[PDB]
Design an enzyme around this catalytic site. Sequence first.
Site, PDB file in Angstrom:
ATOM      1  N   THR I   1       0.669  -1.106   0.025  1.00 32.90           N
ATOM      2  CA  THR I   1      -0.181   0.014  -0.073  1.00 32.90           C
ATOM      3  C   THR I   1       0.985   1.352  -0.143  1.00 32.90           C
ATOM      4  O   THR I   1       1.779   1.483   0.706  1.00 32.90           O
ATOM      5  CB  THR I   1      -0.961   0.085   1.408  1.00 32.90           C
ATOM      6  N   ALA I  49      -9.180  -1.196   6.556  1.00 31.31           N
ATOM      7  CA  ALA I  49      -9.793  -0.442   5.621  1.00 31.31           C
ATOM      8  C   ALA I  49     -11.067  -0.461   6.176  1.00 31.31           C
ATOM      9  O   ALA I  49     -11.848   0.898   5.810  1.00 31.31           O
ATOM     10  CB  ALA I  49     -10.017  -1.640   4.483  1.00 31.31           C
TER      11      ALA I  49
END
EC number: 3.4.25.1
Lengths: 125, 196, 196, 222, 232, 203, 187, 187, 212, 220
Positions: I1, I49
């Site tokens: 990420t 998330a």
Amino acid sequence: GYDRALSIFSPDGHIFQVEYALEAVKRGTCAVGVKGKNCVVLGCERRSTLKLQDTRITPSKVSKIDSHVVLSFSGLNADSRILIEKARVEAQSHRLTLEDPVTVEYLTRYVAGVQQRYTQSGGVR
Amino acid sequence: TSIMAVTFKDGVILGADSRTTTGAYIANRVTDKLTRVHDKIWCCRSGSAADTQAIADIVQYHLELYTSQYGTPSTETAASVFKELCYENKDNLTAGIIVAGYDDKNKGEVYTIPLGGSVHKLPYAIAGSGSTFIYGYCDKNFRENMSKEETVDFIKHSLSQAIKWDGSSGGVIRMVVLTAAGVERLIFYPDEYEQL
Amino acid sequence: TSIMAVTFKDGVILGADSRTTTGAYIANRVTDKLTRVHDKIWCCRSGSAADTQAIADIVQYHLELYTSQYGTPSTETAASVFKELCYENKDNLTAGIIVAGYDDKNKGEVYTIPLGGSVHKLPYAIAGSGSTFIYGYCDKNFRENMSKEETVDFIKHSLSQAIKWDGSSGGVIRMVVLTAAGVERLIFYPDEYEQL
Amino acid sequence: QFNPYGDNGGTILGIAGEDFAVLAGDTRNITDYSINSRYEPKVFDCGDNIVMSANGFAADGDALVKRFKNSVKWYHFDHNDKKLSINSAARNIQHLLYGKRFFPYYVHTIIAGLDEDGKGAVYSFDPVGSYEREQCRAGGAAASLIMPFLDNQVNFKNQYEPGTNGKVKKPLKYLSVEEVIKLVRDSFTSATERHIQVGDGLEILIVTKDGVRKEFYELKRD
Amino acid sequence: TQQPIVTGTSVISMKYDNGVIIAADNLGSYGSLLRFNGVERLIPVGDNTVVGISGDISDMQHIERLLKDLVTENAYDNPLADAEEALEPSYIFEYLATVMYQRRSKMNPLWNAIIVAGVQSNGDQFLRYVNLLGVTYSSPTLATGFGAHMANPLLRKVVDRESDIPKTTVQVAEEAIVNAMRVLYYRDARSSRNFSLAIIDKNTGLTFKKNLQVENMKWDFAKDIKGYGTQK
Amino acid sequence: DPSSINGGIVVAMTGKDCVAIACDLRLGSQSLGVSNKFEKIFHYGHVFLGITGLATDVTTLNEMFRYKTNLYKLKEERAIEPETFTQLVSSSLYERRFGPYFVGPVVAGINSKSGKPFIAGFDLIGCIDEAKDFIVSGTASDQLFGMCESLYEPNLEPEDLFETISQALLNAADRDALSGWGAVVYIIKKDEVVKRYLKMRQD
Amino acid sequence: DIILGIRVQDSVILASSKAVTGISVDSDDKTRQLSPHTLMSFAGEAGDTVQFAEYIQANIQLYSIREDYELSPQAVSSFVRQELAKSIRSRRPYQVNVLIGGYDKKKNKPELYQIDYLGTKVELPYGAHGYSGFYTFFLLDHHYRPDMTTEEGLDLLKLCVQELEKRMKGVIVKIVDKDGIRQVDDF
Amino acid sequence: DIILGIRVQDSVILASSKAVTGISVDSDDKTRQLSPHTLMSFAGEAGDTVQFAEYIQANIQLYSIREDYELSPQAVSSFVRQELAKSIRSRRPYQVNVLIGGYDKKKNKPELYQIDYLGTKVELPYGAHGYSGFYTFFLLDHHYRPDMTTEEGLDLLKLCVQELEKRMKGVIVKIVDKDGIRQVDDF
Amino acid sequence: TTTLAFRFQGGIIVAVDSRATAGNWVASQTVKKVIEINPFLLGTMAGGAADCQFWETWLGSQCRLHELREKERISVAAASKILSNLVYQYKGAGLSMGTMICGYTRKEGPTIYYVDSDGTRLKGDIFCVGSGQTFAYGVLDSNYKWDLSVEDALYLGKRSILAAAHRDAYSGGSVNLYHVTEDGWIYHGNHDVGELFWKVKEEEGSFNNVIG
Amino acid sequence: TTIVGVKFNNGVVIAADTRSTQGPIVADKNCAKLHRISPKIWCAGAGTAADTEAVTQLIGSNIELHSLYTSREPRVVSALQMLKQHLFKYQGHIGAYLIVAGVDPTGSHLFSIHAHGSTDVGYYLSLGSGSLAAMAVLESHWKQDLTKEEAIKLASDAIQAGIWNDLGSGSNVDVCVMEIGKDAEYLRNYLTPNVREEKQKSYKFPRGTTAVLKESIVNI
């Protein structure tokens, strides 16, 4: 606890406790506020009490809620002190949470909300 | 496991159950826990199956060499050979053994080698997980100089109770009789000993 | 601890040893493990002494309140109160209890509450560390409708064997007989039951 | 020392078409190496032409499905029988999942239906509650086997025009429902071949503007 | 419950063309000690339902109390309690599954595995399973714990698919159940020779047989087994 | 897990009268790409071996097997066949039963006398897996299984086998974080061997 | 521990941090000249690095004396990799990572090798050990060209060193080429 | 985390490092003006420090508004110590260390207080939190004089900051005196 | 990420990747790592998330309520304060959140606040968060200027994300771009990393170590 | 894996499945689990596949050398003893669970060996992860006297039960029959009840779809 409905409606649609609180305001000393071009002036009348009163330590009616906002009142003095303390706590909390001092309208709305809540809650006057 | 050996007037009798478990599952309904190490010297095995089987094999080998060199070994000698292996390897093995033998002079003899590797000579011996439940009954019922039938009945009753109360023991009851007349094998099925 | 209760023709008999241990040290040679909870309802306690004593106190209090309000409670009701206490607090207590009672209609009754908090009604019950060693003997010797003397002899023999084999049990043998004639106490000393 | 969770296996797959959606699932329920049942459906029609499957720990999945059906019922009660769209259902499921943030349902959730424009829609939910709308999504034991095949066959990944020297990718086309069914069947048969926990049967729910219909096929029982 | 103490063994069951059959042994074991004999682990709730429970015995008794309370509460202010308003296997299973899952969610489970068997009002058979985690499933044959490893393979020989249910008579199903019980007694070390069986049929009533013993066994060949490996 | 430190994948398939073996090119430490030119496929005569796992173990096994195959050729006066080389690999791996190499070797070849293609795979302790269709190894083994059980056909010409194995490798590597920085394919016939480098998304 | 290396068209440039790790005031050199045309830089656990480097240097000097010949950089790298692979299986493995720079006289070309403590050898146009790669690879990927001269390689190395100093003192820079091994003093 | 303070004859000087925990490009200030003549600097676990400092500042400003009067530095320090002592017994204690500088107008004297997360309050001529003391105390002990002026204290602080920078960028320096609180720009 | 956001004369540039991983297997390459809180505020995603999505949607609700009550657009400092206070209320529970809140108001200008699940709240100019933050931050530091045009700033963000995705195994898939101005945020698209790598290699001449 | 052994009137039959897995992933769908120690002595192994294969190979080599030395046919007890001692020497670290059957001049023999070195003698035996279902079948249907055909059917049924009900077992059935006076009969894939059905389509790619950077010829 004590939760009696002190403020209720009358057959003509009036709330007598609010009207009597207005009469109590009428009994209080006279306060005045005027707007200028770039200033606001607050005037208050001192009661013609005894001449043995110490001016240094007696509360002076006009209270600074914050460095930019002041409040004066008319009516019962101790209730005014309660409202002033609540306003100061709310001003500090708002300055903490939003990183900005309160507006005049915001503080006025908060104080009016406290008064309305006392008009509608049970067990209080 | 429920194993025992009883001395009686004419010799000795070994007895055992036949259940082997791997926890809750019965991995072998029909196990022979009575292992011959010499013509009239046998043993009852309890504990780790691999350890006891290996020990019995080594003891049989050593006793065969002894017989070829020195003559017929005594029951005490066989117990000593078992004891050496159990005591010197006690940190790696789990074996409880009952050694039972016959000879003309001493008649029948029983030795017990529990965990740790010590040897104790007893008129009768009991071992295994199911032994705990029959410590009283046997102590209340064992006599000396019993006939063969009485010894068979005693072993049958004791092993039936041990099977009844112990979940790790069951199956058939196997018995080996060592006397002057020789070696005899006996078997008793659940429909026989469960009515006792 | 070795505790038991046996139903017989005229009622019920409770029996127990008197040894309390704190490991290897005998902290009390003379302990009374037979606790009365009602005039003809008693219990044998095993496990944590504090837990069993507190439970017995609470049961006695509840049964006194029941008697004042509703009348004489049955043995089943007392067992039920014991069961509620044991089952609802099973994550914090260690108590194995044998409840024995007498009444005119049902004669003598025995209930067992082992660890966990389940109740089982039995013609006779045994519990404690020393019970394991007498599972066979009692199963081989218990009969029904035995006389008082036979029941006393059975309990004496069983408890003597349990004391003999268990290191956590010993001392004197205490017995309480509940019959229509009432409550009787009996005691037997080691010089009596060790000759059996 | 209790371990309130389990695994239960299972494999599900959702694919969104131009004017339809497909949600298919295995029907095998297992604990560790034994078969609990060979026909235990895990794909349900939760009203308003919405299909749902929560694969993983079976108890948590059943509880979540029951809660979502009850939520649909109360949404109809409180809003004058208004139709619950697919995005609203996805948000409601996110809130249902995040309501157990610190003791979560141990399931991967997939829902399917039609959006407000009539197009197919599939939403995927992690156990915590995060969700996303995707064209194709597999979940469960054999997802790692199924997914690359659908990447190659549905999205035409790593495929080029034969003669352009790998300079023109193979153009995408809108698959029909029959082609999607064939791809699903092939994927599940391959998974049955290679994955121990997949087998027995396969059940497919297809959602169009005309409603929800079901099809069943047999998989290898071993 | 954080750890079981007194435990019962497997419960086995299967559906046939007209009804359902369930069975379980009568032993309560105490950590490798076969302590209690005569523990009934099949509880008939009414005339159309039998609940078979395995695991902790104290939690089983608690569940029995709950079932009796449920029956009593259903009878209140219900003139059709012995009629179309009687309790059904589906109701009982839904209630039990709710209880199991709620107690799992509180980290205080009932350490049990439960099979509910019966016949619905319309005549359809009912057979479902729920365990201490709240996991539920249905199948033409059901078994928990040890039986799930040995009874299921035999029973699935008789009823392998839903299509085999109409072909299975009550006699064949009962013979299969009895044979499975005998196999479990052969190979399960926590099992007993004494068991109970229950048949729920749509035409006839509930038949509850107790004191059933595992019949003639094969033990003679044991006499041929000598010592391990090379002896004799 | 040492086997999942460096990454990498190897596939092998059988054709009509041909064989194919493909590998990825990535070499990374944990999640940082170190080299995109690390080939996992070697050949000793006409026998090909592809190794996945620890890069050090891959190099060590390649050197050891080159040693052993050279000595075998010197003593036998003939090249070693895939079937015997498979047994040699199995024995070499089992000689380290307790300190094992963390490797994933796969053998592909064509028997010179018979002409039949041969393929086999090994675990880290030398268990032999003989397959008539395909063999996979590496960190993306499940993805490779999924691709191969769907794309493979029993008899393919080398031109079709190339496409099949290349697509399987690429689509399995695009779903593995530790695999894929380039890709090599070997197509092996009786009298010719072709090596092709594929174009890939890199990242 | 900063160990970095860049191979340009005619040479190899190695950079090693002149820092230690306490309390002292020195200018540590973490390189050993294995041969007149082969240099090795090391990093890792203290003690092991110096011992391993001296062992390798002694063995290479012994071979050079015995054969009156200089081993190629490829053979030196293979020998070092074999030593590290043997070490990783030993009772006390060496926790050492190395960069080897050389100028093959036969092929007349510069060569750079990177080996880690496990025994993984890779030949690279540029390499690093430790955290230098994580902060240097963006610049190396953007700016590197295989046909760069010595001055261009030095400028790129200077940019890399400044980037390392941004997220922290000084480095020692060595050049290996056809004339042998030298140390840069203007850097 | 560099938090340092020196009390000289007429004033108090506080120094706080301007750095944060990553990857970002800022000029962090770790001080809060509790009152026109009382300043507080903080260090410790991220998140807790800012929350605690803002809580203290809000309470002190509320008291000042209520009484129309300024609390003395001693009372402020006692209130902060009470808050930290309460926190250490709570479910989530604050992991914050503080220095409080003030100029008592009634006594007309500067005051410096050091409090740790446990609640240990000490009044000192000079103090520090973290590892600043271990590398600064030799110089502070050798050079400090209670009668130093503003310039002398600033020079001593500059020497201390240079010593800290030797064994590591920049600090923010605040002065509290009779005229109130100011920030040094020439430093 | 990899996520990044920076300020410049034209406003704010936000650039994110789209890969999510569950160990070695890539679960998804179509993850949206920019939360659209409201048409004037953007929030990046890192860590958990679900936490980021849930709490930034809740933050959008709170900003809407604030604008209803005060009849003015909320300040970015105030919204970041709300989020930081909320996450501090949960400290120790197990939340994972590192986000950038980006906005552009008349009084503040363009503003970025980094808010962490540890209670940290930092006002900044350039932020890069994730397992590939080092390469992207190196690119940004080498090429950042205040007077960058909008096209140059967007290209710089894309190039930084590409540099991070090339080397970081757990980074890649595609690049999502966003531009934040006074009137709101403008989406500048999704760009596939694989095609972007070859295009950049051809146009710049970089990545010479990769055979194309 | 599921492995069984059954005696009959004049010999012994062993049987096994053909699935080998590494966790939940099938590594080999057709694996040989019947190992030849000697021409009339066969072993079926469960547990670690490499251990089973290597140990059977070593014991078979030693048995062949011993048979050459003694000029006599190998005996089952000799293989049993050698396997038992080799396994006991390693204290269970070699994960092999064996069913060893054979015919020798002394008769027909069937034994089971565990990884720790314990051995058992029985008429019917099962081992592996699917051994419970197979043993259920064996206890249901085994008889004291069986013909060769009945024994083959019973062993195949037990292996099929393991295939159907155990997740770690499946695919085909391999059988080996040893009779007193006959040669050993090894039946590979005696039953193949798991044949994959045809796919819904063919995924053969057109030529030229895969992008290529470079091509070269390799000299072998």
